[PDB]
Every structure is written in C-alpha cells, then in structure tokens.
C-alpha cells in the first residue's frame, strides 16, 4: 500500500461497428437491438496473463480505453468503466467489478461460443445469451445520456466474428420477441465496417499518422426540432399566391412524371405507370388540391417563421410570366399539358439557396416529428408494416440523395416566388458560435519527449498535413501545459496553417494556408535563435517580407517538436529518422545546415499526447484563482483545509465547477459484520463509524454544493454538473426462473445535494449563517449516512467490502470564503485520520497530516504514447460469417501501480 | 551571379552606384524579392543561388572549403588558393571522423549521376575554390 | 476451507490419486486481487505428490477435485491457508488465497 507496485500486463484494444444508438424524448430511433458475437480461436494463456475477451455494450461518450495503463490494473476494455457493460463468459462486468453470473455450462469464452447481447433502452437493460442458454444476470437502470454500440475488448490471441444479422453475419439464434438485428442501425451516410475507439494513431502509407479527437453524435442529434409555424398568421398579399403557387408546383410534379413516363389511369398502378392525379390541378379532386394548398401554405408560412421578409415587388413581372409551351406528346391521357411557368430569368442568389437549404431541412424535420408521433423509427432497411422507415431520421444525417432531392422541389418553390415578383430577404443570420467544446482542452497536442529538448544546433523535421483542418505545428518548451492552446502562451511557437498564422503569445498572419498533401518543414537555429517555416520546400514569409517566422529567441531550456490536431484532424509527423523519408529536406535545408531532429537515433523517438482524461492533482500552489488554507485545530475547532477564490468580485475572475477530493481515501473492511459529550472509551475504541464535515461558507449558495465522496474511477469533468449526472448501474442475479438473488447498486460518486438542505422559507434569499453538512461512514457494514445542521437526512448508501472512497465536494462558488473540509469527529465517532492512517487506528484525537490535502480535477493530462501498438485484422468475411476481428501478436507491458488511487 | 558579387564586394564605388541609383529610382526591392544591403539585389540573388553552389560541393569538401576561406582572409589570389588546394590535396573531410559526414554523404551519394564527378582533382579545387570565395565575401558582406 | 469453481472444462474422469503427481500452473492473488505468485511468470510447471503435504491444505484438498485438464478457482480460507502466521513478507496474517489454478496433467 505505500511502495510503488510494478507487473507485467497485456496490452488490450477495443473494437465496434459503426452502429449508435440511444434514447431521447421524441427520438427517431428504435428502442431494442440485438447483436453476436462467435468465438473462433481463443489462445487461453499466449503471455503469462490470461487472455482477455469480453463483449457488451459502451456508451460514445464516456467510453475511452486508451492503449497503456489506466484504471486498476492496465488492461481496461468492456466492464472496466462505469460507461460499458461485458460479460465474459463467466462475469458480468462493469465499473472494474467482476460479479459471477451463474449460466448452464459455466466457462471462460471459448472457441465455437456465441454471445447474443440483447439491449432494452425502456427499461433500460441489457441481457446476455451463451450458446442459446439464458446468463442468469441483468444490468439496469443505468444512464442514458449518450449513443450505444456494440463493442469487443481483447488482448492478443482472439479470432472472433460481429453476427449483426442481414447480410453482416447470419444469426445463430433467433432475436428474442420484438428486438431488431444492429445492422439496421447504420445510418444512412454511412457504410457498415469495424472501427477502433477513440484512437490517437494509426498506421498509413508512409508511417504512422496522428489522429485529433473525433466528432461524436448525440443521443439528442436524432430529434427533429423543426420550427413553429401554426402561430405563422399568413398574410393576405401571400393568400393571393398560395393557390397559383400551388398549381404552379403541380404542373411541374405533373411535368416530371410524365418525364418519368407516368401516364393518366383511375388507380394507383405503378407498374403500369397509372396516375389519375396526373389531370389539371383544376381538374384535380377537391381534398388532394386542399391538400397541395396546404402543403403550399406551409411553405411561405415557413418562410415567415424563419424570419424572411418577402413582399411584391413588380406586377409587371407577374404579367410578364409566360408558361412554357408544352410538347403535344407530353399529351398523356389525362387529356392535359401540365404547364409550367418559365422561371430561366430567375437567378437564386447564394444567400437564397441557403435559405432554400433551411426550408427543406424543416419540412422533413416537420414531417419527420409528426412520424415519430404516430410512432415510426429509423431502420436501414424499409418496413412498412412495421413503421421503420430509412428516412426517418433528422435531416442533417440524411444522404445527399433525398436531401437534393428535397431541395429541387423547394428550389423551384422559391423561383415561382421570385417570378411572380417577390423580394425575399433572409434573416440577418446572427452569428450564434457553437462552442460545443473547450478549444483549450479539445484539440490533441503531440509533444517529442522532454529528454530529446534541443538547446543548440539547427534542425529540421516534417510534418504532412493529410487533411486541410485545423492543425498547428512547431516547437514547445518542454514546461508546455496539456489544457493551454498551442502559442496562447510563450510556451510554443507554431505555425496554424489553416488560415496561415505564426501562433506565439497570440496571433499574427504568415504564411499561406496549405491544402490537402502538404508538407510543413519547421526548422530551429538556435545558433541564430530563430525559427522558420516551409510549405512544400519553399519557405513561408511575414507579410513584411521577412524569411523568419520567430526572432530572437531565448533558449531556455530548450525546445522540442510539437504539433496539435483539432477534432477530425490527421498529421504525419516526420521527425527524420530515416533521412530519405524526408521529402523535401534536400530543397530547404540540407545546404543551409539543417539537421534532421532524429538523425542519429537508434530508435523512433518517443512521443507524449494531452490525453483528455480528467485526473485529480493536488491544487497548485500558485494557482491564480484557488487557495487552500491549512487550518491548525484548536480547542473548539477541528483541523480544516479552507478554499477561498483569490480573484473573486473583479475583471478577469474564474467562476467555473470546481471538483475536489481529498488525497487519501478510506477502504471498507473485507468482511462486513453479519447482519455529557465525553466519548464512552469502550464505544470509542470498538467503533467502525467515521466521520467528517463540511462548512460551505455564508455566502456561498448552499444550492451550487455537493457533499459527499468518491471513488478512484471519478472522472466526470461535467460544468452543469447535477446529481442526475452521476454514473449508476445495477446488476441483478436471479435465477432461472427469475427470482432475483441480488440487486447491487454500482456508482461513483455518493452525495448530497446542498439544496436540499435549505429551508423552504430561506430559498430565494442569501443567508448570513454556514452550512455544515456531515458525513459519516461504517466501514463493517457499508452504509453511508449524511446530517445537515446536526438534523439526519434521508439520503442513504450502500458499498460493498474493499470498497474505497475519496472525501470530495464538488462546488461552483458564489462568495471569497466556499467551503471547508472540517476532519473532526462526534461524540463515539472517529475522525477521518483514524480510518486513513494505520498507526492512528485507535486515536480519536483529530489530525491532518501533510499528506492529507485538497486535490481537484484537471481536464487534460499528459500521457507517454506507446512504442508499439497492438496489430489488429478487421475485415468482412461474408455475408453470413460476418465480420471478422482478428490478433495474434502479443504485448506487454511493465506498469507502475499506485495502490492508494487504484490506477 | 558570384562573379558579380565578387566584383560588388571588392570594388567599391560599384556600391555607392548601386545605392544612387536605388534611392533616386525609389525602387522598392522588398516587391522585387516578394536601400539597405539587405536589399541590395546584388547580394539577394547570390543568396538565393548560393544552394546551387553548394551543391556541387560534396561534404567531404567542409573542412577545404574552411581552409579556402583562410586563405581568401590571407588575401591571397584565385590563383593562390587554387594551388594551395592543389598540393594541400589531402586535410579532406573523411567519412568515419562523425556521423555528420556519414549521412550527409550517404544521401550526396543518393543524388543520381554523382558517381563519375569528384573523381578529378582539378575538378574538386575547381569547385572549392569557387565556392569558398563566394562564401569568404559574403561573410565580410553580412557581418561589416 | 477451499471452495473450487471451474473456468475450463477438464476431461471430467481422470482426478489425482492419491501418490500420484501433478502438474500445474497457477496464479496466486490475495483476497483483494493483489498478485503475489505465479508459475506463469516463471514459465514452468509447478509439480508437486499429493499425501506429502508439500503444499498447503487448500491445494491439498482443491487439486483433488479438478479433472486433468481443467482449469478452476481455488478460494482458500485463512485456516487451510498460511493462517495466523502467515508466510513473512508476502501473505499478510488471516489472508484468504485466490487461485487460478491449470492442472496440465499427471504424472
């Protein structure tokens, strides 16, 4: 528990197919799913470790096994997180606890099995089937604030094959009652395949490419949210239009179907190509011509609600508007010549056509909404009885096929307006910037080691740019920090060739921008203390005309190379290894004296990536806005760790969440026991309840705090943060006909809502008295119990044995003074220090050792890349064996352990 | 264009005609290139052909052209140095001394066609003493 | 204690006999999943003759369940393990002992 703990463990990799899926209010999409897995070759021990292999679902965000050591002990796939759930054959798997589910014929996955995984998003749960026989065991209950797909974890030594049904893998088994084979799930501009998760590396043709995060769906990005219109009152000068507008959009469907080789019949006959409708709009039945009116009323209501103004402009325009002469053999039956009127003269402008893009993206999110409400879903493949449909999706995920095919028709809608002479201004479209993400935090960075910094000579290295985005490019000090964009600070200077700037402390224009292909030579004189800039070997200059991008340059401590790729981002970065791989090295810069960076080197240069993992460090003791105050006990106050905001009430004040534990935990026993204000020395000295508390300032809005503890695997940087947030699952056994044996509640955080505390009355009010809210733990039976004020609350947990957990608050503040960690105790209660630290095991007297202190969550962190990744084969074997995941080659890795935070 | 250099830098009313004529015309160079000696385009072409030059040189060739530029220090004439190289023959870079002049070599190697050149030692003094005088005048050029 | 669970079927019939010897491998955790032993990590088989009591009484009593071939989960209270004494420096005093244990074949 205090020395370091090292083993050797395997690498283990995660794939999926492109298959999301969730639940939302009003959501297009399906709620059951239903996939396999069979097992082909399974080597049980090809390292001294057993071979992973499990399978189950994830969830998109949240589910990020990077390859290394991460939580416990390395080897992190499905079940490992509170974001997946696996089973393995003979364990359920989630939150990094194996439960053992009973099932006939118990064994460990092997050659020949077939897991059938079954997903319910009502309940919700997911269900598990081994070889047809039930898995006597459910997870349920859990969120579902994100997208779920299939997933398999593995190490070396697995050959499996995805049963998704269709023409992806035949199932071996029939899906139970009402579920629907995952491969109807692909949307439509996308084609079925295996992917990785979450990868920062990849292999390409000329070496290794490095990936920027990728862009992710939301469970949310399957709403329709079209607009308003029935509060749209139509105008009367528009009234006048919308019939003509509606015969006008007849003769033109009827002009394309006689294109198409419709003719005039009584009936529906496709076959034959029939259409009665086909007849003069005049001649049209009464409810189907309402019906193009309406259709049409929709339309210029639309246009309103979107906030175009449109008005008439020239009636001599209108009059002018000729209809075009129509060949006699487009004489069908119908015994009609659907005329259109020639709108040739009628020019869209760009601004126009986006707003035509926006009229067709509404009416198929309205038409969209009112299927859902009838109760239709997405579905690949069509079924009308059913009501699954392959359209029924929002409109901006529709292929451009029907989206084209939507925008003629609304094309031509808005040229019969302007013919008739309307002017059609659009909105002022404000700018409304996204901001989905933290730039900061969002783009990954790519750092040489800090071993390899450079603090003399001239060198030389290459960077291609594989796409066109957002990429930035140069040299770091090797203090960078992970969270701050690169040459925000004095950190980096870089080059951002995406609109072409020098980035060093702000930003400057330089350069040109590159396209797709080319390639960045950066090269640092340190002898001149100078940096320059080439694209495609001839070299970048300033707008001043100068050939450098930096001058002069401090050393320091030297400099490394470094680039960072915005999400969707792919770079290759040649730092020069093999010199001939350098492709324009010899243009620029072998004559001037440059020398690659990784000339002579034995091996490939090691590289660190800023891994968006939010971990827990000690609060920095310069940190510009938080200060934590080491507060002595004294004779009617117990020791306190106090947090105060130094930059608060003035420009440039941080108020964010703020997430804070405390350094050390406390570790539930192994067994739980079967079933005036002095302390009592017996019940002192035999007692297993701890306690400590927490003052939330007056001032300090009790309504912004959660109190309460965690465990290791907290790692929820979430700034609208609730206890709604809050990852849970639970995991129930039964047996074969139902009768649950066990129901075990699974999270990772366990607190109380300040606001749940504040009296009735005193809600809407600032108060001038402190909260305390106390905590109190028993670590021989598990429970967890709060007090508010000295008055029990409601709220109640369970744990179960080993488990460990972190003192922590969580707080937005409102005031100077925010909280306080009081680690005292109550009457027969011990302090905290007394279940953290074994030689104080039976002290009562309240202490705060140095190595107790305040840590809080940062975003971003730096992370070693490894040398070698696993080589995975993913490929499709046919259309009834299924897609095939394969990996032979073994590797290990020696891994450091820290015992007290589990990872 | 070194020729030239080298005339602009040894004689030098050339340099005060160069500057007349630049200041009266109002001639922007930076315009030219996209006044000061910088702008001097005399110098800014050299500049921009020196790679040319220093192409032919092999990398062996490093430490002769160090000792050229010595004796362009000397003052001694092309004829001077050209014989200085021709008995001095030997003193040139060998290939095991560092890793520097193993892989420069290895890609100079790599360049098709340079298999048969550097096989003529008048050849090599050519190319040294040219070059080497290029570089011992626009050092004395860049730093005054 | 040794309460024994199967992760791999074994042949199901041929079981130690008294006398005989087995060979296994095995990967020793304590009851929180700390690794202490493994002749894995070693990369050879452990070997060792029932009725000799060259091993504690929860191997003793747990191997003799398992069928040639099989692999299985050895749960081993504190009393058949190392016990109050508890072997100094590796297995802490009153630790339970997980096993997972392959017996390769008999010999």
């Known amino acids: 528990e205090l020395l370091l703990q090292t083993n050797l463990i395997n690498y283990v990799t995660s794939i999926r197919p492109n298959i999301f899926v969730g639940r939302a209010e009003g959501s297009t999409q399906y709620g059951k799913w239903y996939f396999e897995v069979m097992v082909d070759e399974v080597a049980p021990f090809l390292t001294a470790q057993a071979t992973h292999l499990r399978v189950g679902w994830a969830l998109s965000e949240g589910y990020s096994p990077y390859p290394g050591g991460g939580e416990g002990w390395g080897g992190n796939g499905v079940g490992d997180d509170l974001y997946s759930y696996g089973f393995d054959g003979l364990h359920l798997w989630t939150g990094h606890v194996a439960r053992p589910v009973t099932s006939p014929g118990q064994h460990l996955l092997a050659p020949e099995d077939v897991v059938s995984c079954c997903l319910d998003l009502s309940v919700p749960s997911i269900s598990f089937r081994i070889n047809g026989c039930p898995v006597q065991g459910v997870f349920e209950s859990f969120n579902l604030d994100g997208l779920f797909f299939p997933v398999v974890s593995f190490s070396a030594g697995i050959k499996v094959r995805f049963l998704l049904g269709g023409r992806h893998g035949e199932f071996k088994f029939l899906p139970p009652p009402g579920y629907a084979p995952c491969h109807e799930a692909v949307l439509p501009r996308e084609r079925l395949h295996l992917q990785p998760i979450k990868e920062y590396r990849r292999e390409g043709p000329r070496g290794p490419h490095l990936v920027g995060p990728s862009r992710c769906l939301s469970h949310l990005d399957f709403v329709p949210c079209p607009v308003d219109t029935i509060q749209i009152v139509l105008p009367p000068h528009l009234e006048r239009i919308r019939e003509k507008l509606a015969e006008n959009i007849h003769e033109l469907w009827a002009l394309t179907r006689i294109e198409q080789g419709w003719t005039y019949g009584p009936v529906r006959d496709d076959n034959k190509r029939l259409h009665p409708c086909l007849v003069n709009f005049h001649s049209l039945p009464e409810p189907e011509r309402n019906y193009n009116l309406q259709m049409s009323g929709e339309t210029l209501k639309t246009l309103l609600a979107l906030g175009c103004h449109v008005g008439m402009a020239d009636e001599k325009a209108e009059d002018n508007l000729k209809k075009t002469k129509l060949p006699k053999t487009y004489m069908m039956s119908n015994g009609y010549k659907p005329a259109p009127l020639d709108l040739s003269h009628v020019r869209l402008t760009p601004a126009q056509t986006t707003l035509v893009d926006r009229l067709a993206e509404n009416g198929h999110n309205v038409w969209a909404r009112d299927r859902v409400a009838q109760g239709w879903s997405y579905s690949a493949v069509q079924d009308i009885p059913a009501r699954r449909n392959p359209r029924l999706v929002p409109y901006r995920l529709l292929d451009e096929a029907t989206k084209r095919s939507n925008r003629d028709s609304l094309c031509q809608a808005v040229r019969t307006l302007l013919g008739y002479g309307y002017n059609i201004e659009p909105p002022d479209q404000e700018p409304s910037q996204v901001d989905s993400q933290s730039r900061g935090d969002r783009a990954r960075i790519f750092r040489a080691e800090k071993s390899y910094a450079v603090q003399s000579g001239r060198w030389y290295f290459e960077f291609e740019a594989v796409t066109t985005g957002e990429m930035r490019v140069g040299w770091a000090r090797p203090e960078l920090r992970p969270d701050v964009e690169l040459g925000a600070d004095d950190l980096a200077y870089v080059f951002n060739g995406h609109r072409g700037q020098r980035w060093h402390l702000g930003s400057e224009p330089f350069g040109r921008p590159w396209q797709s292909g080319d390639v960045v030579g950066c090269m640092i004189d340190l002898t001149e203390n100078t940096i320059i800039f080439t694209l495609n070997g001839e070299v970048l200059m300033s707008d001043s005309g100068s050939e450098t991008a930096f001058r002069d340059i401090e050393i320091g401590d030297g400099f490394l190379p470094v680039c960072s790729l915005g999400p969707g981002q792919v770079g290759h970065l040649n730092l020069g290894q093999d010199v001939s791989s350098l492709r324009f090295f010899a243009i620029c810069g072998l004559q001037e004296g440059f020398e690659p960076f990784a000339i002579n080197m034995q091996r490939p240069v090691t590289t660190w990536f800023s891994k968006s993992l939010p971990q827990f460090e000690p609060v920095p003791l310069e940190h510009p806005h938080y200060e934590v105050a080491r507060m002595d006990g004294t004779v009617d106050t117990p020791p306190c760790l106090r947090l105060t905001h130094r930059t608060w009430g003035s420009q440039n004040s941080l108020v964010e969440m703020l997430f804070l534990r405390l350094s050390l935990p406390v570790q539930f026993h192994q067994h739980f026991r079967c079933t005036d204000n002095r302390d009592d020395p017996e019940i002192i000295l035999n007692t297993t309840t701890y306690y400590y508390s927490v003052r939330v300032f007056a001032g300090q809005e009790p309504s912004c705090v959660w109190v309460g503890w965690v465990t290791p695997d907290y790692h929820q940087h979430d700034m609208s943060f609730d206890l709604s947030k809050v990852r849970a699952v639970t995991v129930t056994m039964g047996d074969e006909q139902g009768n649950v044996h066990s129901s075990l509640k699974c999270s990772n955080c366990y607190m109380v809502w300040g606001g749940d505390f504040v009296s009735p009355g005193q809600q809407g009010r600032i108060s001038h008295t402190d909260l305390v809210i106390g905590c109190l733990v028993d670590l021989a039976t598990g429970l967890m119990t709060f007090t508010a004020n000295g008055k029990e609350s409601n709220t109640f947990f369970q744990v179960e044995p080993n488990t460990k957990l972190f003192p922590a608050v969580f707080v937005l503040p409102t005031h100077q003074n925010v909280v306080q960690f009081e680690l005292g105790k109550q009457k027969n209660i011990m302090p905290l220090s007394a279940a953290m630290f074994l030689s104080e095991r039976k002290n009562p007297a309240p202490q705060c050792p140095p190595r107790l202190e305040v840590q809080m969550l940062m975003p971003v962190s730096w992370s070693r890349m490894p040398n070698h990744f696993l080589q995975v084969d993913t490929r499709r074997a046919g259309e009834r064996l299924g897609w095939a995941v394969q990996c032979q080659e073994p590797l290990m890795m020696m891994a450091l352990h820290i015992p007290e935070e589990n990872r | ?144 | ?107």
């Open chain 2, 1 to 144: 264009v070194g020729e030239i250099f080298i005339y602009w830098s040894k004689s030098h009313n050339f340099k005060r005609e160069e500057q007349n004529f630049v200041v009266q015309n109002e001639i922007n160079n930076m315009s030219f290139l996209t006044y000061s000696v910088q702008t001097s385009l005399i110098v800014a072409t050299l500049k921009k052909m020196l790679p040319i030059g220093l192409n032919m040189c092999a990398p062996t060739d490093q430490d002769l052209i160090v000792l050229a530029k010595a004796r362009y220090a000397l003052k001694d004439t092309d004829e001077e140095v050209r014989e200085f190289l021709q008995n001095n023959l030997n003193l040139q870079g060998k290939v095991e001394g560092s890793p520097s002049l193993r892989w420069q070599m290895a890609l100079y190697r790599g360049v098709p066609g340079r298999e048969e050149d550097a096989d003529d030692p008048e050849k090599i003094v050519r190319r040294v003493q040219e070059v080497s005088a290029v570089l011992y005048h626009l050092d004395q050029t860049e730093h005054p």
């Open chain 3, 1 to 107: 204690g040794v309460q024994v669970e199967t992760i791999s079927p074994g042949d199901g019939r041929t079981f130690p006999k008294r006398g005989q010897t087995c060979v296994v491998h095995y990967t020793g955790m304590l009851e929180d999943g700390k690794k202490f032993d493994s002749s894995r990590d070693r990369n050879k088989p452990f070997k060792f003759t029932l009725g000799k009591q060259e091993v504690i009484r929860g191997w003793e009593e747990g191997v003799a369940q398992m069928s040639v071939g099989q692999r299985a989960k050895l749960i081993i209270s504190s009393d058949y393990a190392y016990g109050a004494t508890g072997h100094p420096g590796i297995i802490p005093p009153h630790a339970t002992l997980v096993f997972d244990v392959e017996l390769l074949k008999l010999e």
